[PDB]
Coordinates of N, CA and C and ligand atoms in Angstrom, one line a residue:
Chain G
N1 N 0.8 -1.2 0.0 CA 0.0 0.0 0.0 C 0.9 1.3 0.0
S2 N 1.9 1.3 -0.8 CA 2.9 2.4 -0.9 C 3.1 2.7 -2.3
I3 N 2.8 4.0 -2.7 CA 2.9 4.4 -4.0 C 3.9 5.6 -4.1
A4 N 4.4 5.9 -5.2 CA 5.5 6.9 -5.4 C 5.0 7.8 -6.6
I5 N 4.7 9.1 -6.2 CA 4.1 10.0 -7.2 C 5.1 11.1 -7.5
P6 N 5.5 11.3 -8.8 CA 6.5 12.4 -9.1 C 5.8 13.7 -8.8
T7 N 6.7 14.7 -8.5 CA 6.2 16.0 -8.1 C 6.8 17.1 -8.9
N8 N 7.8 16.8 -9.8 CA 8.5 17.8 -10.6 C 9.1 17.1 -11.8
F9 N 8.9 17.8 -13.0 CA 9.2 17.1 -14.2 C 10.5 17.7 -14.8
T10 N 10.9 17.2 -16.0 CA 12.1 17.6 -16.6 C 11.9 17.4 -18.1
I11 N 12.0 18.4 -18.9 CA 11.9 18.3 -20.4 C 13.2 18.1 -21.0
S12 N 13.4 17.0 -21.7 CA 14.7 16.7 -22.2 C 14.7 16.5 -23.7
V13 N 15.7 16.9 -24.4 CA 15.9 16.8 -25.8 C 17.0 15.7 -26.1
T14 N 16.6 14.7 -26.9 CA 17.6 13.7 -27.3 C 18.0 14.0 -28.7
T15 N 18.7 13.1 -29.3 CA 19.1 13.2 -30.7 C 19.2 11.8 -31.3
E16 N 18.9 11.7 -32.6 CA 18.9 10.4 -33.2 C 19.3 10.5 -34.7
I17 N 20.4 9.8 -35.1 CA 20.9 10.0 -36.5 C 20.6 8.7 -37.3
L18 N 20.0 8.9 -38.5 CA 19.7 7.8 -39.3 C 20.2 7.9 -40.7
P19 N 20.9 6.9 -41.2 CA 21.3 6.9 -42.6 C 20.1 6.8 -43.5
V20 N 20.1 7.5 -44.6 CA 19.0 7.6 -45.6 C 19.4 7.1 -46.9
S21 N 20.6 7.4 -47.4 CA 21.1 7.0 -48.7 C 22.6 6.8 -48.7
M22 N 23.1 6.5 -49.8 CA 24.6 6.3 -50.0 C 24.9 6.7 -51.4
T23 N 26.2 7.0 -51.6 CA 26.7 7.5 -52.9 C 26.3 6.5 -54.0
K24 N 25.8 7.1 -55.1 CA 25.4 6.4 -56.3 C 26.6 6.1 -57.2
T25 N 27.1 4.9 -57.1 CA 28.2 4.5 -57.9 C 27.8 3.8 -59.2
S26 N 28.7 3.8 -60.2 CA 28.5 3.1 -61.4 C 29.9 2.8 -62.1
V27 N 30.1 1.5 -62.4 CA 31.3 1.1 -63.0 C 31.1 0.7 -64.5
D28 N 32.0 1.1 -65.3 CA 32.0 0.7 -66.7 C 32.7 -0.6 -66.9
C29 N 32.0 -1.7 -67.1 CA 32.6 -3.1 -67.0 C 33.7 -3.2 -68.0
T30 N 33.5 -2.9 -69.3 CA 34.5 -3.1 -70.3 C 35.8 -2.2 -70.0
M31 N 35.5 -0.9 -69.6 CA 36.6 0.0 -69.4 C 37.5 -0.4 -68.2
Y32 N 37.0 -1.3 -67.3 CA 37.7 -1.7 -66.1 C 38.3 -3.1 -66.4
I33 N 37.6 -4.1 -66.9 CA 38.1 -5.4 -67.1 C 39.3 -5.4 -68.0
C34 N 39.2 -4.8 -69.1 CA 40.4 -4.5 -70.0 C 40.1 -3.3 -70.8
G35 N 40.6 -2.1 -70.3 CA 40.3 -0.8 -71.0 C 41.4 -0.5 -72.0
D36 N 41.0 0.3 -73.0 CA 41.9 0.8 -74.0 C 42.6 -0.3 -74.8
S37 N 42.1 -1.5 -74.7 CA 42.7 -2.6 -75.4 C 41.7 -3.3 -76.3
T38 N 41.7 -2.8 -77.6 CA 40.7 -3.4 -78.5 C 41.0 -4.9 -78.8
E39 N 42.3 -5.3 -78.5 CA 42.6 -6.8 -78.7 C 42.0 -7.6 -77.6
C40 N 41.4 -7.0 -76.6 CA 40.8 -7.8 -75.5 C 39.2 -7.6 -75.5
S41 N 38.7 -6.5 -76.2 CA 37.3 -6.3 -76.2 C 36.6 -7.4 -76.9
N42 N 37.1 -7.9 -78.0 CA 36.5 -9.0 -78.7 C 36.5 -10.3 -77.9
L43 N 37.6 -10.5 -77.2 CA 37.7 -11.7 -76.3 C 36.6 -11.6 -75.2
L44 N 36.5 -10.5 -74.6 CA 35.5 -10.3 -73.5 C 34.1 -10.4 -74.1
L45 N 33.9 -10.0 -75.3 CA 32.5 -10.0 -75.9 C 31.9 -11.4 -75.8
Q46 N 32.6 -12.4 -76.2 CA 32.1 -13.8 -76.2 C 31.9 -14.4 -74.9
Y47 N 32.4 -13.7 -73.8 CA 32.4 -14.3 -72.5 C 31.1 -14.3 -71.8
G48 N 30.1 -13.7 -72.4 CA 28.7 -13.6 -71.9 C 28.3 -12.2 -71.6
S49 N 27.0 -12.1 -71.1 CA 26.4 -10.9 -70.8 C 26.6 -10.4 -69.3
Chain M
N1 N 39.5 4.8 -64.4 CA 39.2 3.4 -64.5 C 37.7 3.2 -64.7
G2 N 36.9 4.2 -65.1 CA 35.5 4.0 -65.4 C 34.6 4.0 -64.2
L3 N 35.1 4.3 -63.0 CA 34.4 4.3 -61.8 C 33.8 5.7 -61.6
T4 N 32.5 5.9 -61.7 CA 31.8 7.2 -61.7 C 30.9 7.2 -60.5
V5 N 30.8 8.4 -59.9 CA 29.9 8.7 -58.8 C 28.9 9.8 -59.3
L6 N 27.7 9.4 -59.4 CA 26.7 10.3 -59.9 C 26.2 11.2 -58.8
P7 N 25.7 12.4 -59.1 CA 25.1 13.3 -58.1 C 23.7 13.0 -57.8
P8 N 23.2 13.2 -56.6 CA 21.8 12.8 -56.3 C 20.8 13.8 -57.0
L9 N 19.6 13.2 -57.1 CA 18.5 14.0 -57.8 C 18.2 15.2 -56.9
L10 N 18.1 15.1 -55.6 CA 17.8 16.1 -54.7 C 19.1 16.7 -54.1
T11 N 19.3 18.0 -54.5 CA 20.5 18.7 -54.0 C 20.4 18.9 -52.5
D12 N 21.5 19.3 -51.9 CA 21.6 19.6 -50.5 C 21.0 20.9 -50.1
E13 N 20.5 21.7 -51.1 CA 19.8 22.9 -50.9 C 18.3 22.7 -51.1
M14 N 17.9 21.6 -51.6 CA 16.4 21.3 -51.7 C 16.0 20.5 -50.5
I15 N 16.9 19.7 -49.9 CA 16.5 19.0 -48.7 C 16.2 20.0 -47.6
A16 N 17.0 21.0 -47.5 CA 16.8 22.1 -46.5 C 15.5 22.8 -46.7
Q17 N 14.9 22.7 -47.9 CA 13.6 23.4 -48.1 C 12.4 22.5 -47.9
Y18 N 12.7 21.2 -47.6 CA 11.7 20.3 -47.0 C 11.7 20.3 -45.5
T19 N 12.9 20.1 -45.0 CA 13.0 20.0 -43.5 C 13.0 21.4 -42.9
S20 N 12.6 22.4 -43.6 CA 12.2 23.7 -43.0 C 10.8 24.0 -43.3
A21 N 10.1 23.2 -44.1 CA 8.7 23.2 -44.3 C 8.0 22.1 -43.5
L22 N 8.8 21.1 -43.0 CA 8.3 20.1 -42.0 C 8.5 20.6 -40.6
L23 N 9.1 21.8 -40.5 CA 9.4 22.4 -39.2 C 8.8 23.7 -38.9
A24 N 8.2 24.3 -40.0 CA 7.3 25.4 -39.8 C 5.8 25.0 -39.8
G25 N 5.5 23.8 -40.0 CA 4.2 23.3 -39.9 C 3.9 22.7 -38.5
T26 N 4.9 22.0 -38.0 CA 4.8 21.5 -36.7 C 4.6 22.6 -35.6
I27 N 5.4 23.7 -35.8 CA 5.4 24.8 -34.9 C 4.1 25.5 -34.9
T28 N 3.5 25.7 -36.1 CA 2.3 26.6 -36.2 C 1.0 25.8 -36.5
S29 N 1.1 24.5 -36.8 CA -0.2 23.8 -37.1 C -0.3 22.5 -36.2
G30 N 0.8 21.9 -35.9 CA 0.8 20.7 -35.1 C 0.6 19.4 -35.8
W31 N -0.3 18.5 -35.3 CA -0.5 17.2 -35.9 C -1.5 17.3 -37.1
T32 N -1.9 18.5 -37.5 CA -2.9 18.7 -38.5 C -2.4 18.9 -39.9
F33 N -1.2 19.5 -40.1 CA -0.7 19.7 -41.4 C -0.4 18.4 -42.1
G34 N -0.3 17.3 -41.4 CA 0.0 16.0 -42.1 C -1.3 15.2 -42.2
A35 N -2.4 15.8 -42.0 CA -3.7 15.1 -42.1 C -4.8 15.9 -42.7
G36 N -4.4 16.6 -43.7 CA -5.4 17.5 -44.4 C -4.9 19.0 -44.5
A37 N -5.8 19.9 -44.6 CA -5.4 21.3 -44.6 C -4.9 21.8 -43.3
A38 N -3.7 22.4 -43.3 CA -3.1 22.8 -42.0 C -4.0 23.9 -41.3
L39 N -4.1 23.7 -40.0 CA -4.9 24.7 -39.2 C -4.0 25.3 -38.1
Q40 N -4.0 26.6 -38.1 CA -3.1 27.2 -37.1 C -3.6 27.1 -35.7
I41 N -2.8 27.3 -34.8 CA -3.1 27.1 -33.3 C -2.0 27.7 -32.5
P42 N -2.3 28.5 -31.5 CA -1.2 29.1 -30.7 C -0.2 28.1 -30.2
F43 N 1.1 28.4 -30.2 CA 2.0 27.3 -29.9 C 1.8 26.8 -28.4
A44 N 1.7 27.7 -27.5 CA 1.4 27.3 -26.1 C 0.2 26.3 -26.1
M45 N -0.9 26.7 -26.7 CA -2.1 26.0 -26.7 C -2.1 24.7 -27.5
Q46 N -0.9 24.4 -28.1 CA -0.8 23.1 -28.7 C 0.1 22.2 -27.8
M47 N 1.1 22.8 -27.1 CA 1.9 22.0 -26.2 C 1.0 21.4 -25.1
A48 N 0.0 22.2 -24.6 CA -0.9 21.8 -23.7 C -1.9 20.7 -24.2
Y49 N -2.0 20.6 -25.5 CA -2.7 19.5 -26.1 C -1.8 18.3 -26.5
Chain K
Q1 N 63.6 5.3 -63.9 CA 63.1 5.3 -65.3 C 61.6 5.3 -65.4
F2 N 60.9 4.3 -64.8 CA 59.5 4.1 -65.1 C 58.6 4.4 -63.9
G3 N 57.5 5.1 -64.1 CA 56.6 5.4 -63.1 C 55.3 4.5 -63.2
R4 N 55.1 3.7 -62.2 CA 53.9 2.9 -62.1 C 52.9 3.5 -61.1
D5 N 51.6 3.3 -61.5 CA 50.6 3.9 -60.8 C 50.1 3.0 -59.6
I6 N 49.1 3.5 -58.9 CA 48.6 2.7 -57.7 C 48.1 1.4 -58.2
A7 N 47.6 1.2 -59.4 CA 47.0 0.0 -59.9 C 48.1 -0.8 -60.7
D8 N 49.4 -0.4 -60.5 CA 50.5 -1.0 -61.2 C 50.3 -1.0 -62.7
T9 N 49.9 0.2 -63.2 CA 49.8 0.5 -64.6 C 50.7 1.7 -64.9
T10 N 51.6 1.5 -65.9 CA 52.6 2.6 -66.1 C 51.9 3.8 -66.6
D11 N 52.4 5.0 -66.2 CA 51.8 6.3 -66.6 C 52.9 7.3 -66.9
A12 N 54.1 7.2 -66.4 CA 55.2 8.2 -66.7 C 56.4 7.4 -67.1
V13 N 57.0 7.9 -68.3 CA 58.0 7.2 -68.9 C 59.2 8.1 -69.2
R14 N 60.4 7.5 -69.4 CA 61.6 8.3 -69.8 C 61.9 8.0 -71.2
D15 N 62.0 9.0 -72.1 CA 62.2 8.9 -73.5 C 63.6 8.2 -73.7
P16 N 63.6 7.1 -74.5 CA 64.9 6.4 -74.6 C 65.9 7.1 -75.5
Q17 N 65.6 8.2 -76.0 CA 66.5 9.0 -76.8 C 66.8 10.4 -76.3
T18 N 65.8 11.1 -75.9 CA 65.9 12.5 -75.4 C 66.1 12.5 -73.9
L19 N 65.9 11.3 -73.2 CA 66.1 11.2 -71.8 C 65.2 12.2 -71.0
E20 N 64.1 12.6 -71.6 CA 63.1 13.5 -71.0 C 62.1 12.6 -70.3
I21 N 61.1 13.2 -69.8 CA 60.0 12.5 -69.1 C 58.7 12.9 -69.7
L22 N 57.9 11.9 -70.0 CA 56.5 12.0 -70.6 C 55.5 11.4 -69.6
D23 N 54.3 12.0 -69.7 CA 53.2 11.5 -68.9 C 52.1 10.9 -69.8
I24 N 51.5 9.8 -69.5 CA 50.5 9.1 -70.3 C 49.2 9.4 -69.6
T25 N 48.2 9.8 -70.4 CA 46.8 10.0 -70.0 C 45.9 9.2 -70.9
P26 N 45.5 8.0 -70.5 CA 44.5 7.2 -71.3 C 43.3 8.0 -71.5
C27 N 42.7 7.9 -72.7 CA 41.5 8.7 -73.1 C 40.4 7.9 -73.7
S28 N 39.4 7.6 -72.9 CA 38.2 7.0 -73.5 C 37.0 7.9 -73.2
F29 N 37.0 8.5 -72.0 CA 36.1 9.6 -71.6 C 34.6 9.2 -71.7
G30 N 34.3 8.2 -70.9 CA 33.0 7.6 -71.0 C 31.8 8.4 -70.4
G31 N 30.7 7.7 -70.3 CA 29.5 8.3 -69.6 C 28.5 9.0 -70.5
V32 N 28.0 8.4 -71.5 CA 26.9 9.0 -72.3 C 25.6 8.5 -71.8
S33 N 24.5 9.2 -72.0 CA 23.2 8.8 -71.6 C 22.2 9.4 -72.6
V34 N 21.1 8.7 -72.8 CA 20.2 9.1 -73.8 C 18.8 9.4 -73.2
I35 N 18.5 10.7 -72.9 CA 17.2 11.1 -72.5 C 16.3 10.9 -73.6
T36 N 15.2 10.2 -73.4 CA 14.2 10.0 -74.5 C 12.8 9.8 -73.9
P37 N 11.8 10.5 -74.6 CA 10.4 10.1 -74.4 C 10.2 8.7 -75.0
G38 N 9.0 8.2 -74.8 CA 8.7 6.9 -75.4 C 8.9 6.9 -76.9
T39 N 9.6 5.9 -77.4 CA 9.8 5.9 -78.9 C 8.5 5.9 -79.6
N40 N 7.5 5.3 -79.0 CA 6.1 5.5 -79.5 C 5.7 6.9 -79.6
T41 N 6.0 7.7 -78.5 CA 5.5 9.1 -78.5 C 6.2 9.9 -79.5
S42 N 7.5 9.7 -79.7 CA 8.3 10.5 -80.7 C 9.6 9.9 -80.9
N43 N 10.4 10.6 -81.7 CA 11.8 10.1 -82.0 C 12.8 11.1 -81.4
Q44 N 12.5 12.3 -81.1 CA 13.4 13.3 -80.6 C 14.0 12.8 -79.3
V45 N 15.4 12.8 -79.2 CA 16.1 12.4 -78.0 C 17.2 13.4 -77.7
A46 N 17.6 13.4 -76.5 CA 18.7 14.4 -76.0 C 19.8 13.6 -75.4
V47 N 21.0 13.9 -75.7 CA 22.2 13.2 -75.2 C 22.6 13.9 -73.9
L48 N 23.2 13.2 -73.0 CA 23.8 13.7 -71.8 C 25.2 13.2 -71.6
Ligands
LIG101 C1 69.8 9.8 -80.4 O1 69.9 10.0 -81.8 C2 69.2 11.1 -82.3 C3 69.3 11.0 -83.8 O2 70.7 10.6 -84.2 C4 69.8 12.4 -81.7 O3 69.0 13.5 -82.2 C5 69.8 12.3 -80.2 O4 70.5 13.5 -79.7 C6 70.5 11.1 -79.7 N1 70.4 11.0 -78.3 C7 71.4 10.6 -77.5 C8 71.2 10.5 -76.1 O5 72.5 10.2 -78.0
LIG102 C1 1.4 5.1 -78.7 O1 1.2 6.5 -79.1 C2 -0.1 6.7 -79.7 C3 -0.1 8.2 -80.1 O2 1.1 8.9 -79.6 C4 -1.2 6.4 -78.7 O3 -2.4 6.6 -79.3 C5 -1.0 5.0 -78.1 O4 -1.9 4.8 -77.1 C6 0.4 4.8 -77.6 N1 0.6 3.4 -77.2 C7 1.5 3.0 -76.3 C8 1.6 1.6 -76.0 O5 2.3 3.8 -75.8

């Protein structure tokens, strides 16, 4: 039969940081796998999609 | 090496024009601007609600 | 004599005759895009 009633309050501000997006990257597959080499572009062409 | 980073559709000066219109509605309208036409109400008299 | 890059691909060379230094910049300069309405709607397109 014993209760505890608050008598004075406290208004507090927190913070919360949330990621939303990330950098939009894009790689050029041919230019990376073998770039500036026409002798390799044909070889890569047959390797699939 | 063909690795490109594209820019976002929403610039960092347009984001600030949403999160300053999401912050002048809460102050002057409350929970109403997100549920229909915004209705003004004195700030004190909304904190008490 | 030879300058190799971070990816171990040569980029700076010493001329075998003039003993000078040259820099190599590969050039493909990619990244085209084709803004287009529906080909049904029209043919006009804009390159980016
Ligand atoms: C190499 O030969 C060319 C043509 O004979 C000449 O102009 C140049 O000075 C020579 N370089 C050296 C280092 O002998
Ligand atoms: C194609 O375009 C014509 C006229 O522009 C239109 O009547 C038709 O509904 C369109 N169909 C499709 C599948 O876009």
